[PDB]
Design an enzyme around this catalytic site. Structure first.
Site, short mmCIF file in Angstrom:
data_model
loop_
_atom_site.label_atom_id
_atom_site.label_comp_id
_atom_site.label_asym_id
_atom_site.label_seq_id
_atom_site.Cartn_x
_atom_site.Cartn_y
_atom_site.Cartn_z
N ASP G 58 25.69 37.49 0.70
CA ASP G 58 26.82 36.73 1.21
C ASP G 58 27.56 36.02 0.10
O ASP G 58 26.97 35.59 -0.90
CB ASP G 58 26.37 35.70 2.24
CG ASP G 58 26.29 36.25 3.64
OD1 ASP G 58 26.06 37.47 3.79
OD2 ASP G 58 26.48 35.48 4.60
N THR G 91 33.97 35.59 3.36
CA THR G 91 33.82 34.56 2.34
C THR G 91 34.06 35.12 0.94
O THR G 91 34.79 34.53 0.13
CB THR G 91 32.43 33.93 2.43
OG1 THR G 91 31.44 34.93 2.19
CG2 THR G 91 32.22 33.34 3.82
N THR G 92 33.44 36.26 0.63
CA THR G 92 33.64 36.88 -0.67
C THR G 92 35.10 37.25 -0.88
O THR G 92 35.66 37.00 -1.95
CB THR G 92 32.75 38.12 -0.80
OG1 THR G 92 31.37 37.72 -0.80
CG2 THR G 92 33.04 38.85 -2.09
N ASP G 392 26.14 37.72 10.72
CA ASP G 392 27.45 38.30 10.39
C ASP G 392 27.84 39.37 11.40
O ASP G 392 29.00 39.42 11.85
CB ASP G 392 27.43 38.87 8.98
CG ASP G 392 27.58 37.80 7.91
OD1 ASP G 392 27.97 36.66 8.25
OD2 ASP G 392 27.30 38.09 6.73
#
Ligand SMILES: Nc1ncnc2c1ncn2[C@@H]1O[C@H](COP(=O)(O)OP(=O)(O)O)[C@@H](O)[C@H]1O
Ligand SMILES: Nc1ncnc2c1ncn2[C@@H]1O[C@H](COP(=O)(O)OP(=O)(O)O)[C@@H](O)[C@H]1O
Ligand SMILES: Nc1ncnc2c1ncn2[C@@H]1O[C@H](COP(=O)(O)OP(=O)(O)O)[C@@H](O)[C@H]1O
Ligand SMILES: Nc1ncnc2c1ncn2[C@@H]1O[C@H](COP(=O)(O)OP(=O)(O)O)[C@@H](O)[C@H]1O
Ligand SMILES: [Mg+2]
Ligand SMILES: [Mg+2]
Ligand SMILES: [Mg+2]
Ligand SMILES: [Mg+2]
Lengths: 153, 144, 74, 538, 105, 93, 525
Positions: G58, G91-92, G392
């Site tokens: 993540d 997020t990435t 996720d």
């Protein structure tokens, strides 16, 4: 070990090992309440008899062997060393050098003065390229560039 | 970064290795090997280090098993003799009278350095310098 | 086992009068078996063994006499 | 011109004590090296000729054993990749109970060969895919290598022969005796119902008489002493109480209210009379042995002595539950007399002295019972700990046999056969994964190699002979450790057998650990903290 | 031990020689000459006499059974068993690992 | 010091820490450069606080010349080595 | 500086130093998190101070566990935390887009351009990009296949191949089980219980509940076939009076009577439970299970076991609602009026033990509206990684169900938005066209990073994708196996529309705010 090296030049490890083993076994005997004087007398007698037996039975006269005996002795001495595998050539070089520096003295005794063989070291090519100079090798150069670097006669 | 404040840009093996201070004596031995190769022939300085590392790794492979180092050393020396024989077998001669061949040899020698951008000029400089420094006096040949 | 075999060979040599050729049986370290070293060409000077024996005996005798140590402080 | 500044970016934003490793050279090779070092540390304890290791933990507690899981547990491993290998070993121990050293050896070999494959030019993903394919192929092949099945678990001789191999690796000198003891203990347990409980086997370690004086007892032994005058009962009618042997009190607040002289005079007499009535009511049911888990009041002890009742007090509630299972009684929460169904029966309860320890023995003469106890003798506490570890391994082997009855040949024969078959399969696999498959097959050589190294012979000709024989078609021929020179023999007749489940789970866990270690590309370690352990682990 | 191939013969002979420590220690503690007493005991036991041991008061050897030097066989049985177990445990160990101390204070 | 030791084999250049010698706090705070000299067991130079007279980015030649100002510094390349009883040689005799 | 003049022990960066510091921090974060993007990304290893191992991929978990003490890093971490808390993904991509936005903005700012122009261009480009995203979204009836594809596009990027394959079925089936038509999905009804005794591929879905505790009385049944489930929040253990009651007696008999009479309150409720059990079932086949949020003392446990009742105490608070929705009973806070219609039913209840901890399984329910996910693995870090992956995936499937549309993945939408922004750039008046171009270049980071992680080179792969998109007009993404252009819609590579919208909004806002910061101060001491 230093004395063994100075007076013989070989077996400087065997002498130390034998001395330590003798001391250890003698201490064991002493701990068995055997007086150290008796142990010392026995050790003296045993050493004397061992030398006598060696000189009487186990020696081999090199007169009937020849140069092969010298080659084999050099090869045996050079085992356990960095030049052990290359003994087939190193022993020949050693024997040639020793025979080259041979001289005779009074009473007709052939004396071989080792330490007259100037050993020069120089890194570079393989050990097979080690040179046996038929003469003398100096670690010195000419004093000035004007002089020639090669004189024939 | 030189300890006295200098800056060294190089990809030469000996130039890089001479500037490294190490504590392990094996690294000292390897550095001395690099210096020996540089002084003896002046080329192949990274190659000898890489080859020594690879041979020592493949030796450790057997040392992990129950093979004595003396056997490995004997095999290595036999291999070295065979390598010398094969290298002499696959070699070809050079006519030193041919300037073009000598220039090409120097070029192939300096293709791996920063001077390769100006190859013809550097090759001509080196060849001319070596040719005019050649000397022969009292039946002795020298380059110096 | 190797030293036992060597000792057996040498004992048979010293006992049997017709086996005086077994005095040369030593060790072949490559094959791990006894070997006639005189034929194999493993030689060393007699002076080496004689001097080593004498020197080791003298050193052991010298150390064996010590039964009291006084170590004065510097 | 005299200092290298930290590179702009992540290097400058890193904390004071943190470490960052990224890429093949400084992460993957370091992890593989650490795992190889751990495997080397544990290697010399593999096989029957393995060597015990003296391990001293941070609490000066001394462990001497050749059990890989114990050695890893008592080692302060700090490298995280070796930590994963340790977790894999512990998972194998929990799941099966044997094969931890196999897990370490296989994982180390896999990671070393993976390092070689990465060096020669392969990629991490290709190596992982090849290892997964080879692991699937090995799990497919393994059922075909089963040589024989247990086919009986109520027999003593057959079970002893089956567990001899399991407890031959530890205590190689004397394994027949331990095999007989553990076989008897396991056969007593494991009733007609197919379920078998490992916990039901109890081990009591009493110093003094050497490990050959050990025995199995159909009951329980408690290193305690009777609290009453009675010290032996021949027809025990044990009644077990979880409550203290005393008059119970109100849980809210006890207050004796005295308003007249008569109440003060009669209170103690009434209390004593009530306690006597309760004890006599308990005794009137025939219960000549009373066991409690709490304190024993002086008045209750007096009245129990008056009625010839044996008192045994057990501090641990686990001991109380195990005793209830052993005898067949119900732990009454009150001081009421036990009904005919709640009353336990034991064939003999007596106080005895073994060595210098006073023990209370609940003995069943029948060759049955819910719980069996193995009393261990010896001349050293560490020796008895090692014997107990061997007993645990044997009991776990018996449990696995109850689960799955299939067995595979031991001594590296199964490993060599797997290596040969996987190599044959990989030779026919086009693509770059053939290298990884062949390396996975070669990793199996580490088991016979370790066995030959520990036995004191050269591994090279042992493995060559194993390949020659297995090419000839003998799939049951492995290493022979009863020889001074490299030799092999058929091991189906020799009796050395490994459980199918043990090999299956060991291979699966070792492959999973190796792949998980290989998948890591970057390591970010926080600054170490000298805290007194996290609260969760206590 | 004189009736086995020879690898175990040396070790069993070493065990037998090690069993001689008790009379030797008795003689050493008593101020005797251990070697002579041991030689006499060995010669006597070889030629017969099961219960010949060290006689402390007479500086010699004597029949200890008739001298009322009696100890139960259990003592020697347990001594031999425990000593053998300890020796085997010590010999079996090859590596010693010492973790760093915790809470050194 | 490294350069001078390289070019002066006779000299025996050595360094010490101020903390290991346990000197006074004043030495540790305001006398960091201290080049003590031992010629036969006595000082022939006691150079302390050489920063002012040498700067902060001085090189080997600067220190060499500064030391040679007061006469502190006393006035070929073999292959690798030459050094190898006392019996030398004889003839016939 | 003026602040340093007022406060000597304060450090301040002013003018271009502020931009330099912020952009350097953002670029460092982007450089670290570049390798996370895509299914071909590299797993990272995170070791805490205590030595715990954390294997993850993540962006948010990594950002939390990176040892960073930088203010701009804290800002980006907060933005990513909000993104993860609301949408559960991206997020990435958030960090990558923010870093690339700052880099492209600096590319023009370093040449004397004021950041305000770049921010105006950013706002115009964001508006146009949102319009294009609305235009390009694919409105589809969310059947099982589309949800399977979305779950794959999440889990495959999060975990290994077949593990993701299993987790896809697990997550989709759980979401469909708990989902009620035309009602918001309550993700609290999917209990995530993990055990540590099997392989990672043994993770499955149980159409019921799994509780991490079992019956405390050894005489209780370990397996009940047809169970009447009783969910209660009533204390069945001894409790003292609130007003400091105390007891007063004068003799042993009085003390015995008081001891017997002080347990009557709890015994009355236990008797009510037993009477209900007797009335509801009169055969040995039917079973009774009592799950209590409060404690049960040993006396009540013994009384219940004597009647063949399995009782579990100290249950989790949310387990009340979970059992009510799954079994179908009524959670009771009192036993004043309890009726057989308040009892839930379960088709199988069995107790499973694992080492020192025991588990209770409640399966074979009629139509469970609350299911559980059982995570199995050999390592703690494996369990944590699977837990993050299933979180996720659950968020992705829930978002796909909520918003009826879905956006093609593999960076195709990013390329299309970049092309649309470039085409719209002439319409923007002034020098904000530079900001628009920078925004388009920043949007193009996703295909670049995907190609880089896959092993190809960014420039040639990107120009191939752009040429294919311009020629055909289709939403062609990046093929991570070959690098050739490929239609994301036709292969099942789907991205959440809400995730993309949140990415655009948050990235634009945070980049605009950071670019306008001209001074960082620390003078609170
Ligand atoms: N080829 C060989 N085979 C068997 N024994 C050898 C051989 N070469 C040397 N030895 C023995 O090894 C012993 C050790 O010699 P070495 O240790 O090399 O000499 P030193 O004691 O001077 O170091 C010698 O006593 C010699 O008899
Ligand atoms: N054009 C070329 N093509 C392929 N290999 C080359 C070329 N030029 C040089 N090499 C190789 O590079 C090596 C030289 O590397 P270099 O940087 O000189 O290291 P070293 O000084 O250790 O030789 C030689 O082995 C040569 O074979
Ligand atoms: N008598 C024997 N001969 C040869 N191999 C044996 C014998 N007994 C056991 N083994 C081998 O030893 C291995 C067991 O090693 P062990 O120390 O138990 O490691 P682990 O406890 O991890 O299983 C088995 O694979 C088995 O094949
Ligand atoms: N099979 C695939 N082929 C090509 N691209 C993919 C594939 N699967 C996922 N992607 C792309 O890779 C990206 C994965 O990003 P991810 O690692 O999930 O970041 P985050 O977790 O922050 O969303 C998605 O944007 C998606 O478009
Ligand atoms: Mg020698
Ligand atoms: Mg070169
Ligand atoms: Mg085992
Ligand atoms: Mg995602």
């Amino acid at each position: 070990a230093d004395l063994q090296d100075k007076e013989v030049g070989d077996g400087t490890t065997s002498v130390v090992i034998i001395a330590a083993e003798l001391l250890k076994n003698a201490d064991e005997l002493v701990k068995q309440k055997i007086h150290p004087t008796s142990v010392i007398s026995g050790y003296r007698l045993a050493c004397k008899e061992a030398v006598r037996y060696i000189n009487e039975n186990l020696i081999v006269n090199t007169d009937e062997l020849g140069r092969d005996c010298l080659i084999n002795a050099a090869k045996t001495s050079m085992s356990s060393k960095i030049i052990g595998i290359n003994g087939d050539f190193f022993a020949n070089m050693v024997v040639d050098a020793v025979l080259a520096i041979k001289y005779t003295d009074i009473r007709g005794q052939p004396r071989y003065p080792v330490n007259s063989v100037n050993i020069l070291k120089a890194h570079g090519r393989s050990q097979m390229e080690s040179m046996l100079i038929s003469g003398y090798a100096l670690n010195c150069v000419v004093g000035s560039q004007g002089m020639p670097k090669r004189i024939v006669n | 970064l030189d300890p006295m404040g200098g800056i060294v840009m190089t990809n030469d093996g000996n130039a890089i290795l001479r500037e490294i201070q190490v504590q392990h004596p094996a690294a000292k031995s390897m550095i001395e090997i690099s210096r020996t190769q540089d002084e003896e022939v002046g080329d192949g300085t990274t190659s000898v280090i890489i080859l020594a590392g690879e041979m020592l790794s493949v030796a450790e492979h057997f040392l992990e098993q129950q093979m004595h180092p003396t056997v490995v050393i004997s095999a290595y020396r036999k291999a070295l003799d065979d390598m010398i024989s094969t290298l002499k077998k696959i070699s070809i001669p050079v006519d030193i009278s041919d300037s073009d061949m000598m220039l090409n040899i120097i070029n192939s020698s300096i293709t791996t350095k920063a001077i390769s951008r100006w190859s013809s000029l550097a090759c001509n400089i080196a060849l001319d310098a070596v040719k005019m420094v050649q000397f022969e006096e009292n039946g002795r040949k020298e380059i110096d | 086992d190797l030293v036992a075999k060597l000792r057996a060979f040498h004992n048979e040599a010293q006992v049997n009068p017709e086996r005086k050729n077994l005095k040369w049986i030593g060790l072949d370290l490559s094959n791990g078996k006894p070997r006639d070293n005189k034929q194999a060409g493993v030689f060393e000077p007699t002076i080496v063994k004689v001097k080593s024996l004498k020197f080791a005996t003298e050193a052991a005798i010298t150390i064996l006499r010590i039964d009291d140590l006084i170590k004065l402080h510097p | 011109a005299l200092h290298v500044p930290k590179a702009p970016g992540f290097a400058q934003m890193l904390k004071e004590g943190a470490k960052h490793f990224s890429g093949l050279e400084e992460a993957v090779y370091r992890n593989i090296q650490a795992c190889k070092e751990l495997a080397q540390t544990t290697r010399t304890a593999y096989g029957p000729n393995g060597m015990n290791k003296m391990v001293i933990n941070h609490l000066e507690k001394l462990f001497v054993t050749n059990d890989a899981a114990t050695i890893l547990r008592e080692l302060e491993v700090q490298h995280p990749a070796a930590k994963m290998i340790v977790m894999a070993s512990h998972m194998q121990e929990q799941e099966v109970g044997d094969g931890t050293n196999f897990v370490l050896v296989f994982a180390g070999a896999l990671l070393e060969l993976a390092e070689e494959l990465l060096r020669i030019g392969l990629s991490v993903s290709e190596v992982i895919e090849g290892y997964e394919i080879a692991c699937r192929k090995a799990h497919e092949i393994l059922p075909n290598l089963v040589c024989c099945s247990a086919k009986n678990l109520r027999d003593i001789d057959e079970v002893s022969s089956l567990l001899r191999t399991s407890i031959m690796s530890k205590q190689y000198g004397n394994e027949v005796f331990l095999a007989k003891l553990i076989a008897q203990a396991c056969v007593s347990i494991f009733p007609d119902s197919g379920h078998f409980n490992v916990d039901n086997i109890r081990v009591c370690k009493i110093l003094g008489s050497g490990i050959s004086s050990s025995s199995v007892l159909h009951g329980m032994v408690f290193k305690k002493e009777t609290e009453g005058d009675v010290t032996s009962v021949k027809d025990a009618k044990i009644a077990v109480y979880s409550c203290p042997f005393d008059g119970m009190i109100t849980e809210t607040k006890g207050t004796v209210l005295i308003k007249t002289a008569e109440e003060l005079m009669n209170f103690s007499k009434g209390e004593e009379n009530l306690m006597d009535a309760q004890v006599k009511a308990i005794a009137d049911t025939g219960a000549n042995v009373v066991v409690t888990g709490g304190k024993v009041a002086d008045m209750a002890l007096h009245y129990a002595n008056k009625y010839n009742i044996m008192l045994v007090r057990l501090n641990s509630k686990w001991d109380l539950r195990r005793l209830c299972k052993t005898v067949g009684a119900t732990a009454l929460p009150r001081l009421t007399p036990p009904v005919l169904e709640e009353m336990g029966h034991c064939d003999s309860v007596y106080l005895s002295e073994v060595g210098d320890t006073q023990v209370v023995v609940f003995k069943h003469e029948k060759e049955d019972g819910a719980i069996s106890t193995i009393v261990l003798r010896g001349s050293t506490d560490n020796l008895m700990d090692d014997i107990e570890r061997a007993v645990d391994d044997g009991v776990n082997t018996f449990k696995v046999l109850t689960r799955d009855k299939r067995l595979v040949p031991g001594g590296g024969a199964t490993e060599i056969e797997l290596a040969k078959q996987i190599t044959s399969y990989g030779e026919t696999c086009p693509g770059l994964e053939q290298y990884a498959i062949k390396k996975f097959a070669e990793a199996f050589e580490a088991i016979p190699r370790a066995l030959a190294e520990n036995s004191g012979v050269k591994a090279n000709e042992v493995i060559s002979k194993l390949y020659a024989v297995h090419q000839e078609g003998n799939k049951n021929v492995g290493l022979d450790i009863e020889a001074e020179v490299p030799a092999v023999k058929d091991m189906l007749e020799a009796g050395i057998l490994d459980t199918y489940l043990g090999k299956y789970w060991a291979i699966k866990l070792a492959t999973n650990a190796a792949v998980t270690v290989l998948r890591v590309d970057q390591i970010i370690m926080a600054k170490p903290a000298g805290g007194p352990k996290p609260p969760s682990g206590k | 031990s004189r009736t086995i191939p020879g690898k175990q013969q040396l070790l069993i002979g070493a065990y037998a020689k090690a069993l001689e420590i008790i009379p030797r220690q008795l003689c050493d503690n008593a101020g005797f000459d251990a070697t002579n007493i041991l030689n006499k005991l060995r010669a006597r036991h070889a030629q017969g006499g099961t219960w010949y041991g060290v006689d402390i008061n007479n500086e010699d050897i004597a029949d200890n059974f008739e001298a009322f030097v009696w100890e139960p066989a259990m003592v020697r049985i347990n001594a031999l068993t425990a000593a053998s177990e300890a020796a085997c445990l010590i010999v079996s160990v090859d590596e010693t690992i010492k973790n760093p101390r915790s809470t050194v204070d | 010091m490294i350069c001078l030791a390289a070019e002066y084999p006779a000299v025996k250049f050595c360094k010490v820490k101020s903390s290991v010698i346990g000197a006074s706090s004043q030495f540790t705070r305001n006398a960091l450069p201290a080049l003590l000299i031992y010629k036969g067991g006595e000082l022939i130079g006691n150079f302390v606080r050489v920063t002012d007279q040498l700067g902060d980015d001085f090189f080997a030649v600067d220190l060499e010349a500064f030391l040679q100002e007061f006469g502190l510094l006393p006035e070929v390349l073999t292959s690798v080595r030459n050094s190898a009883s006392e019996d030398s040689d004889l003839e016939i005799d | 500086a003026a602040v340093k003049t007022l406060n000597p022990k304060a450090e301040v960066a002013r003018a271009q130093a502020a931009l330099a510091v912020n952009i350097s921090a953002a670029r460092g974060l982007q450089d670290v998190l570049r390798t996370n993007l895509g299914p071909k990304g590299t797993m990272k290893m995170l070791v805490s101070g205590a030595g715990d191992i954390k294997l993850t991929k993540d962006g948010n978990v990594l950002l939390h566990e990176m040892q960073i003490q930088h203010p701009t890093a804290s800002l980006i971490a907060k933005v990513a935390t909000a993104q993860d808390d609301i949408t559960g993904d991206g997020t990435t991509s958030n960090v990558l887009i923010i870093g690339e936005l700052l880099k492209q903005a600096d590319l023009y700012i370093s040449e004397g351009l004021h950041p305000r122009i770049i921010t105006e261009g950013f706002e115009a480009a964001k508006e146009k990009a949102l319009q294009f995203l609305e235009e390009v979204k694919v409105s589809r009836e969310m059947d099982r296949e589309t949800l399977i594809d979305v779950a794959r596009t999440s889990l495959r990027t999060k975990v290994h191949a077949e593990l993701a394959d299993v987790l896809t079925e697990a997550v989709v089936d759980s979401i469909l089980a708990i989902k009620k038509q035309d009602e918001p999905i309550d993700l609290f009804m999917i209990e995530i219980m993990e055990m540590k005794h099997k392989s990672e591929t043994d993770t499955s879905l149980i159409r019921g509940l799994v509780l991490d505790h079992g019956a405390r009385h050894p005489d209780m049944k370990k397996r009940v076939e047809d169970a009447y489930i009783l969910t209660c929040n009533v204390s069945l253990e001894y409790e003292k009076t609130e007003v400091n009651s105390g007891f007063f007696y004068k003799s042993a008999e009085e003390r015995e009577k008081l001891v017997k009479a002080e347990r009557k309150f709890i015994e009355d409720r236990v008797k009510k439970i037993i009477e209900l059990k007797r009335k509801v079932c009169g055969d040995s086949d039917k079973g009774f299970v009592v799950i209590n949020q409060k404690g049960i003392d040993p006396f009540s446990l013994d009384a219940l076991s004597k009647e063949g009742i399995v009782a579990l105490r100290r249950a989790k608070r949310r387990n009340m609602e979970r059992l009510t929705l799954a079994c179908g009973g009524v959670a009771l806070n009192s036993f004043d009026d309890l009726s057989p219609d308040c009892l839930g039913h379960a088709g199988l209840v069995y107790e499973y033990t694992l080492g020192e901890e025991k588990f209770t399984f409640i399966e074979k329910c009629n139509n469970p509206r609350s299911v559980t996910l059982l995570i199995k693995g050999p390592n703690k870090h494996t369990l944590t990684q699977i837990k993050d992956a299933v979180r996720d995936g659950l968020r992705a499937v829930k978002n796909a169900i909520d918003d009826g549309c879905v956006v093609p993945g593999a960076g195709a939408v990013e390329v299309a938005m970049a092309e649309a922004l470039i085409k719209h750039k002439p319409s923007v008046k002034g020098r904000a066209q530079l900001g628009v171009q920078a925004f388009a270049d920043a949007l193009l980071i996703i295909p670049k990073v995907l190609a880089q992680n896959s092993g190809f080179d960014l420039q040639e792969t990107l120009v191939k994708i752009q040429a294919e998109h311009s020629e055909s007009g289709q939403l062609v993404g990046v093929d991570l196996n070959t690098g050739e252009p490929m239609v994301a819609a036709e292969v099942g590579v789907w991205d959440n529309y809400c995730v993309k919208k949140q990415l655009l909004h948050s990235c634009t806002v945070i980049a605009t705010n950071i670019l306008l910061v001209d001074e960082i101060m620390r003078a609170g001491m």
